[PDB]
Motif scaffolding. Structure first.
Motif, PDB file in Angstrom:
ATOM      1  N   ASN A  59       0.871  -1.195   0.000  1.00  0.00           N
ATOM      2  CA  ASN A  59       0.000   0.000   0.000  1.00  0.00           C
ATOM      3  C   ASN A  59       0.892   1.224   0.000  1.00  0.00           C
ATOM      4  OD1 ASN A  59      -1.336   2.287   1.757  1.00  0.00           O
ATOM      5  ND2 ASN A  59      -2.969   1.132   0.783  1.00  0.00           N
ATOM      6  N   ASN A  60       0.824   2.007  -1.069  1.00  0.00           N
ATOM      7  CA  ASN A  60       1.671   3.187  -1.365  1.00  0.00           C
ATOM      8  C   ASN A  60       1.565   4.288  -0.318  1.00  0.00           C
ATOM      9  OD1 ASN A  60       2.650   2.475  -3.775  1.00  0.00           O
ATOM     10  ND2 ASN A  60       1.961   4.237  -4.900  1.00  0.00           N
ATOM     11  N   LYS A  61       0.404   4.424   0.273  1.00  0.00           N
ATOM     12  CA  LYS A  61       0.088   5.521   1.177  1.00  0.00           C
ATOM     13  C   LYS A  61       0.782   5.312   2.516  1.00  0.00           C
ATOM     14  N   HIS A  62       0.691   4.098   3.056  1.00  0.00           N
ATOM     15  CA  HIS A  62       1.302   3.748   4.328  1.00  0.00           C
ATOM     16  C   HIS A  62       2.566   2.915   4.191  1.00  0.00           C
ATOM     17  CE1 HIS A  62      -2.126   4.973   7.049  1.00  0.00           C
ATOM     18  NE2 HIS A  62      -2.654   5.102   5.845  1.00  0.00           N
ATOM     19  N   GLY A  63       2.867   2.408   2.993  1.00  0.00           N
ATOM     20  CA  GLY A  63       4.066   1.622   2.765  1.00  0.00           C
ATOM     21  C   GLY A  63       4.017   0.223   3.328  1.00  0.00           C
ATOM     22  N   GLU A  64       2.822  -0.280   3.627  1.00  0.00           N
ATOM     23  CA  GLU A  64       2.634  -1.536   4.334  1.00  0.00           C
ATOM     24  C   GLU A  64       2.306  -2.669   3.368  1.00  0.00           C
ATOM     25  OE1 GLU A  64      -0.509  -0.257   6.854  1.00  0.00           O
ATOM     26  OE2 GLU A  64       0.776   1.055   8.050  1.00  0.00           O
ATOM     27  N   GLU A  65       2.842  -3.857   3.654  1.00  0.00           N
ATOM     28  CA  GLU A  65       2.652  -5.021   2.792  1.00  0.00           C
ATOM     29  C   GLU A  65       1.291  -5.658   3.012  1.00  0.00           C
ATOM     30  OE1 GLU A  65       6.280  -7.517   3.699  1.00  0.00           O
ATOM     31  OE2 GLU A  65       6.340  -7.525   1.496  1.00  0.00           O
ATOM     32  N   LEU A  66       0.676  -6.103   1.918  1.00  0.00           N
ATOM     33  CA  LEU A  66      -0.568  -6.848   1.982  1.00  0.00           C
ATOM     34  C   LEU A  66      -0.276  -8.315   2.276  1.00  0.00           C
ATOM     35  CD1 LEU A  66      -3.644  -6.470   1.380  1.00  0.00           C
ATOM     36  CD2 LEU A  66      -3.154  -7.515  -0.847  1.00  0.00           C
ATOM     37  N   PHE A  67      -0.964  -8.899   3.261  1.00  0.00           N
ATOM     38  CA  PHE A  67      -0.704 -10.307   3.549  1.00  0.00           C
ATOM     39  C   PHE A  67      -1.959 -10.969   4.093  1.00  0.00           C
ATOM     40  CE2 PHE A  67      -0.265 -10.881   8.231  1.00  0.00           C
ATOM     41  CZ  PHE A  67      -0.332  -9.575   8.631  1.00  0.00           C
ATOM     42  N   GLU A  68      -1.979 -12.297   4.022  1.00  0.00           N
ATOM     43  CA  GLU A  68      -3.074 -13.087   4.565  1.00  0.00           C
ATOM     44  C   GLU A  68      -2.629 -13.717   5.875  1.00  0.00           C
ATOM     45  OE1 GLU A  68      -4.674 -16.186   2.053  1.00  0.00           O
ATOM     46  OE2 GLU A  68      -6.022 -16.915   3.625  1.00  0.00           O
ATOM     47  N   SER A  69      -3.519 -13.692   6.864  1.00  0.00           N
ATOM     48  CA  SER A  69      -3.185 -14.010   8.244  1.00  0.00           C
ATOM     49  C   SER A  69      -3.644 -15.410   8.629  1.00  0.00           C
ATOM     50  CB  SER A  69      -3.815 -12.975   9.180  1.00  0.00           C
ATOM     51  OG  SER A  69      -3.791 -13.390  10.542  1.00  0.00           O
ATOM     52  N   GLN A  70      -2.991 -15.960   9.655  1.00  0.00           N
ATOM     53  CA  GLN A  70      -3.479 -17.191  10.269  1.00  0.00           C
ATOM     54  C   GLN A  70      -4.817 -16.972  10.959  1.00  0.00           C
ATOM     55  OE1 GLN A  70      -0.742 -20.191  12.231  1.00  0.00           O
ATOM     56  NE2 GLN A  70      -1.686 -20.847  10.295  1.00  0.00           N
ATOM     57  N   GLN A  71      -4.995 -15.778  11.506  1.00  0.00           N
ATOM     58  CA  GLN A  71      -6.218 -15.424  12.256  1.00  0.00           C
ATOM     59  C   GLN A  71      -7.389 -15.399  11.291  1.00  0.00           C
ATOM     60  OE1 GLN A  71      -5.822 -12.138  14.915  1.00  0.00           O
ATOM     61  NE2 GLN A  71      -3.592 -12.223  14.912  1.00  0.00           N
ATOM     62  N   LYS A  72      -8.586 -15.682  11.799  1.00  0.00           N
ATOM     63  CA  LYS A  72      -9.750 -15.786  10.895  1.00  0.00           C
ATOM     64  C   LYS A  72     -11.041 -15.361  11.576  1.00  0.00           C
ATOM     65  N   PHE A  73     -11.867 -14.590  10.877  1.00  0.00           N
ATOM     66  CA  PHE A  73     -13.226 -14.281  11.373  1.00  0.00           C
ATOM     67  C   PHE A  73     -14.056 -15.446  10.838  1.00  0.00           C
ATOM     68  CE2 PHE A  73     -14.475 -12.037   7.319  1.00  0.00           C
ATOM     69  CZ  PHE A  73     -13.241 -11.738   6.797  1.00  0.00           C
ATOM     70  N   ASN A  74     -14.767 -15.239   9.739  1.00  0.00           N
ATOM     71  CA  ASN A  74     -15.409 -16.381   9.048  1.00  0.00           C
ATOM     72  C   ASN A  74     -14.346 -16.736   8.007  1.00  0.00           C
ATOM     73  N   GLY A  75     -13.906 -15.728   7.253  1.00  0.00           N
ATOM     74  CA  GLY A  75     -12.802 -15.962   6.308  1.00  0.00           C
ATOM     75  C   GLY A  75     -11.476 -15.652   6.947  1.00  0.00           C
TER      76      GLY A  75
END
Length: 143
Positions: A59-75
């Protein structure tokens, strides 16, 4: 030829085909290390970088990487990584491949084998294994 057969790298915008809005950072955080992802009507900027046959998405604005987590709501949760430590376990690496619809791509997590997905009219983003409808399809265009 005006489309980009190859996955665009560097500065891009990312728009979901079903929902019709742009992937974006959120104002909301899950913790001080994890920021949420959402959508916006106006184009929000990302940076795509090749990593072998895969890609990292930041994300260009905050410089943060997009990732998928072990934690889960429904998805399984999809987060921006506030800490900025490089994620090396596959969670921040993405396989970006052409879908059946021209200009749209599937964005599939390497670690979890899940495609980025949105329900519809919801500002919530997730990832699931189906990768078979417009909800999974993303238009990626250079800035």
């Amino acid at each position: 030829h005006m489309l980009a057969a190859d996955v665009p790298t560097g500065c891009v915008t990312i728009k979901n085909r079903h929902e019709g809005r742009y992937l974006a950072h959120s104002i909301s955080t899950h913790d001080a290390d994890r920021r949420h992802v959402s959508f916006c009507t106006d184009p929000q900027r990302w940076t795509i970088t090749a990593e072998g046959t895969n890609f990292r998405i930041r994300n260009n604005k905050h410089g943060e990487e997009l990732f998928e987590s072990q934690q889960k709501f429904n998805g399984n949760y999809v987060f921006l990584w506030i800490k900025k430590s490089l994620i090396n376990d596959g969670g921040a690496s993405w396989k970006i491949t052409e879908s059946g619809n021209p200009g749209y791509f599937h964005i599939k997590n390497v670690k979890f084998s899940h495609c980025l997905f949105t329900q519809g009219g919801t500002d919530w983003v997730a990832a699931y294994e189906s990768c078979d409808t417009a909800k999974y399809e993303w238009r990626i265009v250079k800035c």
